[PDB]
Amino acid sequence: DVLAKELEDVNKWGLHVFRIAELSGNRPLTVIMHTIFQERDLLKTFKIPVDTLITYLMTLEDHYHADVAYHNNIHAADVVQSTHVLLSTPALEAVFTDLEILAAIFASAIHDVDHPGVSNQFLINTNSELALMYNDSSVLENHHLAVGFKLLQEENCDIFQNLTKKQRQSLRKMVIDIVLATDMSKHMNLLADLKTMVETKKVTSSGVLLLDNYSDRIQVLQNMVHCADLSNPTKPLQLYRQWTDRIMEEFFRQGDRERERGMEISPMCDKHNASVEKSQVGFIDYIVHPLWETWADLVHPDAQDILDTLEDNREWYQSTIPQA
Amino acid sequence: VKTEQEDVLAKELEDVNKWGLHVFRIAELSGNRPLTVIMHTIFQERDLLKTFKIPVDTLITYLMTLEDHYHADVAYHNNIHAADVVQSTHVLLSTPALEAVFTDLEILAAIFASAIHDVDHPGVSNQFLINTNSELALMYNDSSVLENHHLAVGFKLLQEENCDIFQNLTKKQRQSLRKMVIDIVLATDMSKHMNLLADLKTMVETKKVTSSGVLLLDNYSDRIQVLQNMVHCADLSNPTKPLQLYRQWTDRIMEEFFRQGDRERERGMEISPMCDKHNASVEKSQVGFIDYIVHPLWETWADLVHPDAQDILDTLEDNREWYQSTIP
Ligand SMILES: COc1ccc(/C=N/OC[C@H](O)CN2C[C@@H](C)O[C@@H](C)C2)cc1OC1CCCC1
Numbered sequence: 001d002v003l004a005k006e007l008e009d010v011n012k013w014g015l016h017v018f019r020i021a022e023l024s025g026n027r028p029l030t031v032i033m034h035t036i037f038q039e040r041d042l043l044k045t046f047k048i049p050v051d052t053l054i055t056y057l058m059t060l061e062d063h064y065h066a067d068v069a070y071h072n073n074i075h076a077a078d079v080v081q082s083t084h085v086l087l088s089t090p091a092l093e094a095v096f097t098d099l100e101i102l103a104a105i106f107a108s109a110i111h112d113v114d115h116p117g118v119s120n121q122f123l124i125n126t127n128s129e130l131a132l133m134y135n136d137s138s139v140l141e142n143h144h145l146a147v148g149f150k151l152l153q154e155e156n157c158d159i160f161q162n163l164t165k166k167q168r169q170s171l172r173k174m175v176i177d178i179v180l181a182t183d184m185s186k187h188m189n190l191l192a193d194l195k196t197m198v199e200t201k202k203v204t205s206s207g208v209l210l211l212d213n214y215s216d217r218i219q220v221l222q223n224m225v226h227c228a229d230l231s232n233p234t235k236p237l238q239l240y241r242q243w244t245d246r247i248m249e250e251f252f253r254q255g256d257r258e259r260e261r262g263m264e265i266s267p268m269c270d271k272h273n274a275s276v277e278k279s280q281v282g283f284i285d286y287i288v289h290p291l292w293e294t295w296a297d298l299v300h301p302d303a304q305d306i307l308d309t310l311e312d313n314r315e316w317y318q319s320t321i322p323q324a
Numbered sequence: 325v326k327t328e329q330e331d332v333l334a335k336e337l338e339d340v341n342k343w344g345l346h347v348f349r350i351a352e353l354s355g356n357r358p359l360t361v362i363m364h365t366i367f368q369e370r371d372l373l374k375t376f377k378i379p380v381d382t383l384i385t386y387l388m389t390l391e392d393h394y395h396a397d398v399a400y401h402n403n404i405h406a407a408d409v410v411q412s413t414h415v416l417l418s419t420p421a422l423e424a425v426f427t428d429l430e431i432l433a434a435i436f437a438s439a440i441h442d443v444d445h446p447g448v449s450n451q452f453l454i455n456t457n458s459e460l461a462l463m464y465n466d467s468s469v470l471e472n473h474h475l476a477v478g479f480k481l482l483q484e485e486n487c488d489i490f491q492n493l494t495k496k497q498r499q500s501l502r503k504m505v506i507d508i509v510l511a512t513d514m515s516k517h518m519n520l521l522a523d524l525k526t527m528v529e530t531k532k533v534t535s536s537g538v539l540l541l542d543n544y545s546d547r548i549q550v551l552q553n554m555v556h557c558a559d560l561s562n563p564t565k566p567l568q569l570y571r572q573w574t575d576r577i578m579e580e581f582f583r584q585g586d587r588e589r590e591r592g593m594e595i596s597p598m599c600d601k602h603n604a605s606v607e608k609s610q611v612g613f614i615d616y617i618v619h620p621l622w623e624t625w626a627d628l629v630h631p632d633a634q635d636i637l638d639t640l641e642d643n644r645e646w647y648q649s650t651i652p
Pocket residue numbers: 118119120121184232233243244247251266267268269279280283
């Protein structure tokens with residue numbers, strides 16, 4: 001019906017994911033993953049029973065929190081679909097193995113599962129059980145990985161059951177490497193290294209990137225999923241506005257818990273003294289544009305339309321801020 | 325004192341400041357409470373209860389609970405090993421080249437890290453835990469699986485009734501100590517040894533000393549690097565001890581290794597290097613251990629604190645020759 005038609009846009013930047021969420025009965029992660037697995041022939045390639053895939057996807061989606069405004073199944077579905085588009089970028093054609101593709105997409109799907117709606121720093125500062133378990137280091141990201149993998153153990157949920165032992169081991173390593181790179185405390189180091197990779201990049205005659213060891217390959221996959229994670233401001237304004245609403249709602253909820261606890265309220269988490277437009281322009285200027293302009297460099301000119309949208313949205317958000 | 329255990333014992337504890345304290349004797353004389361007894365002694369000696377306002381009964385309660393979470397049926401990675409690493413770190417901290425270098429909080433961190441650094445060790449390796457798809461390796465994504473766990477347990481036990489030995493630290497002190505203890509225990513992961521050593525060599529190359537040969541450390545990076553390597557050295561100090569101690573440590577690690585190999589053999593897995601009781605060369609393996617891991621590390625530490633560690637290095641070399649001479 002009016003879902004198969006929306007899902008026709010699954011290979012396009014700017015898919016109406018919120019509409020897909022509504023139409024699927026709040027199952028955007030399940031429907032979008034299913035669609036992409038079929039589109040990429042992943043069920044056949046890895047002999048994944050279709051009922052197993054769906055069973056896993058639904059239990060995974062169940063473990064995203066409905067009451068968390070941003071870090072929920074819609075965000076997961078969005079990052080999955082964005083990674084799916086980025087994987088098909090011409091500069092990367094025939095570069096990645098089917099296993100590497102599967103790993104990037106699986107990592108995207110689980111990368112925020114069971115997110116509590118508060119930051120690593122909040123969890124550390126409040127002496128949470130999660131921070132105790134993970135010694136204050138990539139607390140959330142370690143946890144997302146543990147839960148994501150743990151769910152494969154549920155009845156008829158092992159989608160990787162027919163991979164070889166070697167394939168499963170390689171897949172597990174890549175997925176861990178990828179989800180740990182979504183920790184924002186690693187952003188500047190990832191970016192610094194990505195800039196250096198761009199500086200020294202190698203391309204075939206056909207113009208596709210040459211990545212001849214695991215380090216270079218996983219580095220590209222890490223940054224790709226990181227870009228997808230940080231892709232909201234590169235989307236059409238109607239979508240970007242919705243993501244901004246959600247992250248500010250989530251932030252203000254954390255800020256309210258901090259205020260109640262007598263804690264200093266984290267930057268951008270105070271509903272009373274916040275500035276959304278200023279916050280987004282700063283987010284684009286200091287994080288999202290520096291990353292995406294580097295990705296654009298890597299795959300030039302594949303990402304120029306995405307960069308254009310980002311730059312237009314920045315100019316849009318800054319337009320109502322008085323300036324000299 | 326610290327444990328209502330028999331007699332004394334006090335004569336043995338007179339060696340708490342010396343390399344080659346007889347920790348096994350201490351374990352026996354204390355009713356298998358060497359970690360509690362030795363930690364209590366060191367905290368009193370260094371006046372740490374007064375400095376950090378640690379109630380003595382809180383200290384003893386925590387130490388007993390901590391000690392209870394080292395497995396009695398694990399041959400090597402048990403409470404005696406923890407006590408040994410604690411006591412060895414305590415000796416290393418007092419080396420002349422480090423006089424007045426570390427704050428009392430840094431000293432507390434090193435000693436506390438040493439005490440918890442293998443707690444709840446199951447007697448099998450990280451690689452075994454990964455290969456067998458253990459819940460622990462799933463929890464920690466195959467990375468420093470044991471060492472992350474040791475830290476989690478060591479800190480969690482502070483929350484048991486009357487166990488918070490850090491209750492009278494300031495918020496900042498608690499935060500700093502927590503970071504240092506994590507940095508130190510994660511550095512005991514043997515997978516980090518080569519990198520750790522490489523960086524230690526770099527530090528020795530650019531080492532700054534006063535005229536009395538005392539190290540000049542400039543910042544947290546310097547201080548934590550020395551503490552990480554210090555506790556790593558303590559962890560790898562068995563072959564540098566009086567031979568009778570070393571011989572018992574060797575017997576114990578081989579027993580633990582063989583038990584892991586038995587588990588591997590039973591599950592049809594490739595038996596890990598040095599874990600096959602049916603095909604072992606214990607003496608040869610000790611010489612290889614010294615040549616490729618322990619001597620390169622301790623020679624570098626010896627350089628850092630020259631000449632403070634000369635005797636320790638000499639003993640290492642003598643002990644290498646013992647195992648050499650006993651290869652069949
Ligand atoms: C649409 O906009 C966004 C979309 C995603 C995100 C992604 N956020 O992931 C962050 C983690 O939860 C942790 N941070 C939370 C914060 C309270 O403290 C920081 C130390 C860490 C942010 C967006 O805009 C935001 C940041 C800039 C203005 C609002």
